[PDB]
Amino acid sequence: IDRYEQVSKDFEFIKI
Amino acid sequence: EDVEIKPRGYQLRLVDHLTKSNGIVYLPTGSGKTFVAILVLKRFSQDFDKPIESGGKRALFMCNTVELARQQAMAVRRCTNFKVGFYVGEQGVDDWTRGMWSDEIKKNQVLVGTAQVFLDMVTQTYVALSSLSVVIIDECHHGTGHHPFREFMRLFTIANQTKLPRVVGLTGVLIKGNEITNVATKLKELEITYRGNIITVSDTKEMENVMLYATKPTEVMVSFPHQEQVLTVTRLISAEIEKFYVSLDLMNIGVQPIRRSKSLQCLRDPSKKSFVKQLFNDFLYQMKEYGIYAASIAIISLIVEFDIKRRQAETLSVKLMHRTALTLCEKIRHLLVQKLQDMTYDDDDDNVNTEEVIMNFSTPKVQRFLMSLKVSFADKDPKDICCLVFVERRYTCKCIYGLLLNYIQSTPELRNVLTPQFMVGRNNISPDFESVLERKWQKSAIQQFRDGNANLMICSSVLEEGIDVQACNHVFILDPVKTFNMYVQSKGRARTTEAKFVLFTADKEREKTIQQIYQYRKAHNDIAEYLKDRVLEKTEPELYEIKGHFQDDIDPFTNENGAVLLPNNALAILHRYCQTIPTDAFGFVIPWFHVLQEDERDRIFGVSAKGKHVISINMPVNCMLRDTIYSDPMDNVKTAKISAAFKACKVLYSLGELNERFVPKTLKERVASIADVHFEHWNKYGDSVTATVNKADKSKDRTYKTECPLEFYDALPRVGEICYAYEIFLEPQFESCEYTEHMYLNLQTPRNYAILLRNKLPRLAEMPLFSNQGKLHVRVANAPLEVIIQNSEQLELLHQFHGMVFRDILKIWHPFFVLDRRSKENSYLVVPLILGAGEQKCFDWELMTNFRRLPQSHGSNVQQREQQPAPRPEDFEGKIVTQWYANYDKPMLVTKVHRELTPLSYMEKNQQDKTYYEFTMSKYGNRIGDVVHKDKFMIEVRDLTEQLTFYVHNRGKFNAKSKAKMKVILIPELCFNFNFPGDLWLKLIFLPSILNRMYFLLHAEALRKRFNTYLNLHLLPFNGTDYMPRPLEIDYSLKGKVKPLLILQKTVSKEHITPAEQGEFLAAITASSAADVFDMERLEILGNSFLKLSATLYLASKYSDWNEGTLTEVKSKLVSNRNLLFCLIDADIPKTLNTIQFTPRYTWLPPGISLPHNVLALWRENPEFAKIIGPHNLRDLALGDEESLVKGNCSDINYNRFVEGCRANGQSFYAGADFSSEVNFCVGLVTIPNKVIADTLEALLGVIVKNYGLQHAFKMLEYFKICRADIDKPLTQLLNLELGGKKMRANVNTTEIDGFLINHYYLEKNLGYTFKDRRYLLQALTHPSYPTNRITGSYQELEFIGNAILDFLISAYIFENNTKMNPGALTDLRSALVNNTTLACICVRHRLHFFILAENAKLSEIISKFVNFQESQGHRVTNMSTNVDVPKALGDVLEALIAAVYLDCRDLQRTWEVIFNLFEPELQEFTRKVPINHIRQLVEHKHAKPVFSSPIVEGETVMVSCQFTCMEKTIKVYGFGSNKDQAKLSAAKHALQQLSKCDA
RNA sequence: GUAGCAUGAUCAUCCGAAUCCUCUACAACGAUUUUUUCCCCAUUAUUGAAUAAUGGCAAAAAAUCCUUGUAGUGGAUUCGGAUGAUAAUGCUACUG
Ligand SMILES: Nc1ncnc2c1ncn2[C@@H]1O[C@H](COP(=O)(O)OP(=O)(O)O)[C@@H](O)[C@H]1O
Ligand SMILES: [Mg+2]
Ligand SMILES: [Mg+2]
Known part of the structure; x- marks a missing residue:
């Protein structure tokens, strides 16, 4: 895959 | 702090309940439990004041880690007013002794430290468990299995069960590990092990809300997608790493210690290779887990660690392999940075470029971590935010630190808010990235965190517990949550309000993490309710199950004095004792364990051996436990090892190797035990060998009395008695020239004078004199002339003439001089003789009747x-x-x-x-x-x-x-x-010298008679006498086939025995200070060498069951100056010594003249007043002929005036003057340095050896109470010293030893001797690092006697042959000839290195270096040696096989033959040229002025600045060296070479 | 008898050198021990499925001991160099 994918740049924390 | 620290409502009830009964307090961390603990400690302050014996007690505060112990110690110290003792293993209590342990106990009320330290102190009976008030236990959850807490608690079971101290345990977590299911059994085990009942708050609405100020954190979880794709660069790295692994396994280094499984079932890789492989595996795991850029950060740490290891790598092969690993890691870093820059071309702005590279070249989980950080802190104030991050691996912490630093620098928003730091456990990794010791630092990472310098901390579980950390608001967990305890403690760390507990995990493990967290929450909730609903029991009073809690193991054994040996500490005790034995680097101290075999098991044990496992414990050959020991049959190999070590240490204590306190004994115990046998006589002098404070003022020198010989004592002839007249003669040895014929003719006249006595005088040796005009000889007639003094007036005239002789002719008179009437000490007369009835020589009555007083020359006009x-x-x-x-x-x-x-x-x-x-x-x-x-x-x-x-x-x-x-x-x-x-x-002026020398010769003859009588020799050469000799090589008196030694020849054959003559004894008595023609310093060396040999042989044959170190210490102690002086003073010798230079007019007393009797008594009665009498006061008295002739006592008015003058010195400068230097000879007193007596003892021993031989001289030692010889073995003190010294280990006969020794005939032909028993050679060849040998002991016991034999033989030869050369350089010659490096050169010369049955990594390399260097020098002494270093063991084994040759032969003559045969060229080289001085000769050189700075050793190198002068210039030079003193030696060698070249 | 020069020895004081060490505070080194955890494997009880028992393989945590180096001391022995001053010896002038 050569280049690692970008995880969600916008990501608000989830609460258990 | 102060008294403002106020307990809450629950702490008071907790203390009140704990006072009534023991228990374990359970509260969340940060609830003030240490405060309630010290409050409990307040309630036991009753017995802290009183000492132990008075009935007082002390307290014990227990901790598991050093830093936590120190923190709580300073906390309690500031919180109370108690003398807080602090003891840890690092502090140095390992060598603490009884008295200064007890004073420390009595000077403190509360004690803190590590569990091992307090356990060791208790077991060694420094205190009794019943002498304690309360033992506070902290982090009590550690107490399971073989933890020190449980072991310490067991002592309560084994000690007295009444009047036992209170015990309380502290924790915030009750369980260690994954043992959550069925909490109740674990909790009950904790209950019984600490013999207490857990107490926790239950009154909810009153103080649960209160103590919840340490609030629980909010826990959130964030997932990340898995990564699956594998980059090609990763597989290139893997291929290179695996091929490097293969090469590393293939490549060869020296022999290394062998490691294997924990149960020793399977072999293992060598330690250093395992270490490097482990580092590489850790790096691979890092780069797998975190990606590419993180590996780029961590490869720097790998580089720095490898470089440091290479720098400290002493072995050449280790340096080579570390260099190879460094090259591999450098290639890895090159490829890594090449790939890193491969995508940096896009943007030329470094900040965003590095940021996007970080988000690009990293695993997704770290990316989510970074977004979490960025949106969490969101550019807030730096001081307020204090977050924590936990990771598992150590190198992970440094890697994430590097990544975080790079990111923070790449984020201007966070570039000024985050100041991170990382910290790990004890196997510390240098936080630097560049080089070793770049700069010194004094703030711990923990300290910087506490000061706000580090708002972020990266750490493993090392920071989980104990260490006081202020209330943090954020905690992040990267590696998966593993243990219940760490999870609960971490969530307890988040103490401040609205603290966030955050953790990260992969998507596919979300359900597993949910199961774990819910399981842990259940584990806490059921514990809480179980405590809330537990059965009301008092203190777990069920003693039966209390004892059943511990019976499963091996029951500990305790001996008398209360000392008790814990079985779990058997491994520690045995290994520590093994470490106490000196050894080289590879020389293994570890007892080589072994696992038995079932066939061997039932071959040695019964049928039960098949069910369970048995093992064996061996012992390195240095110790005396050559017999192997087998453990009891145990199921698991673990308890098998425990039992083996326990039995082994029990046997060791039985042998007495272990002290009563169950600790290895030092040399101090050995000397303390020996003192009351071999150093008993010191007590009568107020000193003791164990009194190490005597090492302060050893230079002080004492005074002694003097007494004339027995013949001269009270021998004044009495009127009406028979008297002995002894004539003097004077023969001029010099031939006279025309200007000196007067003396030559005059002194040869038949008219001579004689000395008159009333006791008989023995035969006296002829005496040489040195006139101003030639050499002279003096002889005393053997047959005295007999007269009877019929007239008392004849005696009075005789006394007057004798007195007036000294008064007038020789100008020896003094104002206080008085003719002695008392006639006790040195009283006799000298009388002239005139030609009487032909052959008869009557008295010159004319001269005495006329020359009563010499008339005064008047000026006739x-x-x-x-x-x-x-x-x-x-x-x-x-x-x-x-x-x-x-x-x-x-x-x-x-x-x-x-x-x-x-x-x-x-x-x-x-x-x-x-x-x-x-x-x-x-x-x-x-x-x-x-x-x-x-x-x-x-x-x-x-x-x-x-x-x-x-x-x-x-x-x-x-x-x-x-x-x-x-x-x-x-x-x-x-x-x-x-x-x-x-x-x-003209004969009369020579009288005083003759008188003094014959005075000392009489003492010499008395000593000769005493030592001929005591040794019981009364054979034919007893009688007669020999003319006294004089030395030339005494500085001031300037004007093939081996030859057998005469001392050995006379000791084996009595035909060559020779009687000791007065001259040798007198020379042994004449000190060099009293500068006559001779002195004892030529005999002193022989005496010292013989004394060393005798002490060595006696100690070896007496204490053969001891190791080399204690034998060496005791032998050195024996021949010490203090012991020689003490053993000689009671021998009644010193008052008959010749030490003072003879100046008659001022430092001598005439025979017939004494002080006034009354003033003599006053001096001998007022010691308080003796020390103030001065020579001026003595000369103050003016005694005329009346006082000195008719009375013998001064006038009473003159008496009063003289004593007044003596007393007047107090108010003047005369007060306190050391008058002893001027007035001691007036009362027969003198002061002599102790070195003089230490020399004269060996001087007497030297002549007694030389004239007779070794065997007879042996009795002299016991005569001087040197060694308390045993009458049970009479032949020992006489002859068995040359026949004894062996034991069982030199008795067994087997041909297997030929297996150990290969081509032994080649070595025998090189050496020249043939061995009837090869076992002795093997023992001497048995280097300590050689486990495979089990037939014979090591070589130290042989080298100990080889040293003595060699030095004595070489000293005997140099004394007997090297005659015309002074002792002052003979000592240097013998010291050089006995030098270890010379022995090493001799060894390599005949290539005995090949046969050294030894194995060692660095020793093999150093011996290879030395031998190839000597080959380069061609087996010649380089006089020292410019080589880097010399192997001590090489000279040791040579000089030990010397003793081996002797023991195989048991003939000193053969020993001398072989020693001479190897020492021929070196002896002729040293005895011809100046043997050696070195170093010093440069310092005292005529123009060379060398001075040096402090040398610093760096790894395998040392440099020193040599500041010297040469050819009137100053030059600066360096040299290759090994250590500081060796750097100085190499610099001095280079300076010597430069000076030799300049001279040439 | 009188001076100068040279020399030997000794005390005293200062400094140095060699050997042996001790103590202090700091740093490094190596070894051993104890707890905990994961993975995998083996052997059994049973044969496949499934279990159980242990025993072994890697990771984290904690203690103890030894060694080395840094410097300051301090001590013992030997010994040198320097110097007041003391006394001794020899020589070279003035002589007696
Ligand atoms: N009732 C109280 N009285 C006095 N000090 C308290 C009280 N409650 C809490 N403290 C303080 O709060 C601190 C809590 O931290 P500490 O108890 O040392 O951590 P741990 O609980 O791990 O021992 C204590 O140092 C203590 O001085
Ligand atoms: Mg903080
Ligand atoms: Mg605490």
Whole structure:
């Protein structure tokens, strides 16, 4: 895959 | 702090409940539990004041880690007013002893430390468990299995079960590990092990809300997608790493210690190779887990660690492999940075470029981590935010630190808010990235976190517990949550309000993490409710199950004195004792464990051996436990090891190797045990060997009394008794020239004088003298002449004549001198003899009747000279004259009478026109006036030398023709005439030297008689005497086939025995300070060598069951100066020594003269007043002839005036003056340095050896109570010293030893000797690092006696052969000839290195270096050696196989043959050239002035700045060296080479 | 007899060198021990499925001991160099 994918740049924390 | 620290409502009830009963308090971390603990400690402050024996007690505060212990110690110290003792293993209590342990106990009320330290202190009986008040236990959850807490608690079970101290445990977590299910059994185990009942808050709404100020955190979870794709670069890295692994396994280094499984079932890789492989595996795991850029960060840490390891790599092969690993890691870093920059081309702005690279070249989980950070802190104030991050691996912490630093620098928003830091456990990794010790630092990472310098901390579980950390608000967990305890403690760390607990995990493990967290929450909730609903029991009083809790193991054994040996500490005790034994680097201390075999198991044990496992414990050959020991049959190999070690240590204690306190014994215990046997006599002198404080003022030197020999004691003849007259004779050894014939003819006249005695005098040796004109000899008649003093007035006249001789003729008189009437000490007379009835020599009654007092030379004038009678030639021929006319008041001796010559005759020389008379007028006419009887004759006179001490040869250009070139002719009428037999006068000046030397010779003869009687020799050569010799090589007195040694020959054959003559004894007595022609320093070396040999042999044959170290220490202690002095003082010898230079007029007392008897008594009665009497006071008294003749005691008014003058010194400068240097000889006292006595003991031993031999000399040691010889083995103290010293280990016979020794014949032919027993050679060849041998012991026990044998043999040879060369360099020659490096050169010369049955990594390399260096030098001594270093073991094994050769032969003659055969070239080289001085000769060089700075050793290198001077210049040079002193030695060697080249 | 020069020895004081060490505070080194955890494997009880028992393989945590180096001391022995001063010896002038 050569280049690692970008995880969600916008990501608000989830609460258990 | 102060008293403002106020407990809450629950702490008071907790303390009240804990007072009534023991228990474990359980509260969340940060609830103030330490405060309630110290509050409990307040309630036990009753017995802390009183000491232990008075009935008081102390307290114990327990901790598991050093830093936590220190923190709580300072906390309690600031929170109370108790003397807080702090003891840890690092502090140095390992060598603490009884008294300064007890004073520490009594000087403290509360004690803190690590569990091992307190456990060791308790087991060693420093305190009794019943002597304690309360033992506070912290982090009590650690107490399971073999943890030190449980072991310490067991002592409560094994100690007295009454009046036992309170125990309380502290924790915030109760369980360690994954043992959550069925909490109740674990909790009950904790209950019983600490014999307490857990107490926790239950009154909810009152103080649960209160203590919840340490609020629980909010827990959130964030997932990340898995990564699956594998980059090609990763597989390239893997391929390179695996091929490097293969190469590393293939490549060869020296022999290394062998490691294997924990159960030892399977082998393992070597330690260092395992270490490097482990580092590489950790790096691979890092790069797998975190990606690419993180590996780029961590490869720097790998580089720095590998470089540091190479730098400290002593072995060349280790350096090579570390360099190879460094090259591999450098290639990895090059590829990594190449790939890193491969995508940096896009944007030229470094900030965003590095940021996007971080988000690009990293695993997604770290990316989510970074977004979490960025949106969490969101550019807030830096000081407020204090977050924590936990990771598992150590190198992970440094890697994430590097990544975080790079990101923070790449984020300007976070570039000023986050100041991270990382910290890990004890196996510390250098936080630097560049080089070792770049700069020093003093703030711990924890400290910087506490100061706000580090708002972020990266750490493993090392920061989970204990360490005081202020209330943090954020905690992040990267690696998966593992244990219940760490999870609960971490969530308890988040103490402040609205603290966030955050953790990250992969998507596919979300359900597993949910299960784990819910399981842990259940584990906490059921525990809480179980405590809330538990059964009300008091203190777990069920003693039966309490004992059943521990019975499963091996029951600990306790001996008397209360010392108890914990089985779980058996491994520690045994390994520590093994470490106490000295060894080289590879020389293994670990007892090589082994696992048995079932066939062997039932071959050695019964049928039960098949069910369970048995093992064996071996012992390195250095110790005496050569017999192997087998463990009891145990199921698991673990308890098998425990049992094996326990039994082994029990046997060791039984042998006494372990002290009573169950700790290995040092040399102090050995010397303490030996003191009451071999150093008993020190007590009578107020000193002891164990008193190490005696090492302070050893230079102090004491005084001694003196007494004349027995013959001279109270031997004044009595009137009416028989008396012995002993004639003196004078034979001029020199031939006389024309200017000296007067003395030569005069002293040979038959008219001589004699010494008069009332006791008989033994035969005396002929004595040499050194006149101003030649050499002289003196002999004393053997057969005395017999007279009886019928007239008391004859005796009175004799005494008057003897007194007046010293009073007038020799000018020895003193104002206080008085003829002795008491006649006790050194009383006798000397009387002249005249030719009597032919052969008879009666007394010169004429001289004494006339010359009672010498008349005074008066200045006769012309007027009285007219009627004075003319001078008769007979009246003046050979008579004493003096020149009263001139200023010269000394006496004169005439030689011949010039009858034909007359005044007005010209002086022959230089005044052929000037006559004697006219010259006399021109010279002293104002005084003489004129000469009457002008036609009379003249005479010829010669001077009498004023010198009195003729011992030293006054070497010089006397110029016999020029000294008396002037000729002295006088008119008789102008000089006084002492009509006297001038020959008697010129003999009389030599009297004092003869008197003193015969005074000492009498002591010498008495000693010779004593040592001939005590050793019981009364054979034919006992009688007679020999002429006294003199030495030339004594500085001041300037003017094939081996030859068998004579000492061994006389010790084996009595035909060559020779009787000891007075001269040798006297020389042994004459100190070098009393500078005569000889002294003892030539015999001192032989005495020292023989004493060393005798002490070595006796100790070896007496304490053969001891190791080399204690034997060496004791042997050195034996021949110490203190012990020799103490053993000699009670031998009654020192009061008969010759130490003081003999100056008669001021430092000598005449025989017939003493002080006044009354003042003698006053001096001998007032020691408080003796020390103030001064020589001026003594000279103050003016005693005329009456006082010195008729009374013997001064006048009472004069007595009072003298004592007043003595007392007046107190208020003057005379007070406190060291008058002993001037007045000790007035009462027969003297002060002698202790070194003199230490020398004279060996001096006597040397002659007693030389004349007789070893065997007879052996008795002398026991005579001086040197060694308490055993009567149970009489042959030991006489002959078994050359026949004993072995035990069982040199008795078994087997051919297997030929397996150990390969081509032994080659070594035997190189050495020259043939061994009847090869076992001795193997023992001497048994280096300590050689486990495979089990038939014989090590080589130290052989080297110990080899050293003594070699040094004694070489000293005997150099003394017997190297004659014409002074002892001051003989000591240097022997020291050089016994040097270890010389022995190493000898060993490599015959290539004995090949046969050294040893194995070691660095030792093999260093011996290879030394041997190839010597090959380069061609097996020649480089006089020292410029090589890097020398192997001590090489010279050791050579000089040990010397003793092996002796023991195989048991013949000192063969030993000398072989030693000479290898030492021939080196002996002829050292005895021809200057042997060696080195170093010092540069310092004291005529123009070379070398000074040096502090050398620093760096790994395998050391440099030193050599600041010297050469050829009137100053040059700066360096040299290759090993250590600091070796750097100095190499610099000195280079300076020596430069000086030699400059001279050349 | 009188001076100068040279020399030997000794005390005292200062400094140095060699050997042996001790103590202090700091740092490094190596070894051993104890707890905990994961993975995998083996052997059994049973044969496949499934279990159980242990035993072994890697990771984290904690203690103890030894060694080395840094410097300061301090001590013992040997010994040198420097110097007041003391006394001794020899020589070279002035002589007696
Ligand atoms: N009732 C109280 N009285 C006095 N000090 C308290 C009280 N409650 C809490 N503290 C303080 O709060 C601190 C809590 O931290 P500490 O108890 O040392 O951590 P741990 O609970 O791990 O021992 C204590 O140092 C203590 O001084
Ligand atoms: Mg913080
Ligand atoms: Mg605490």
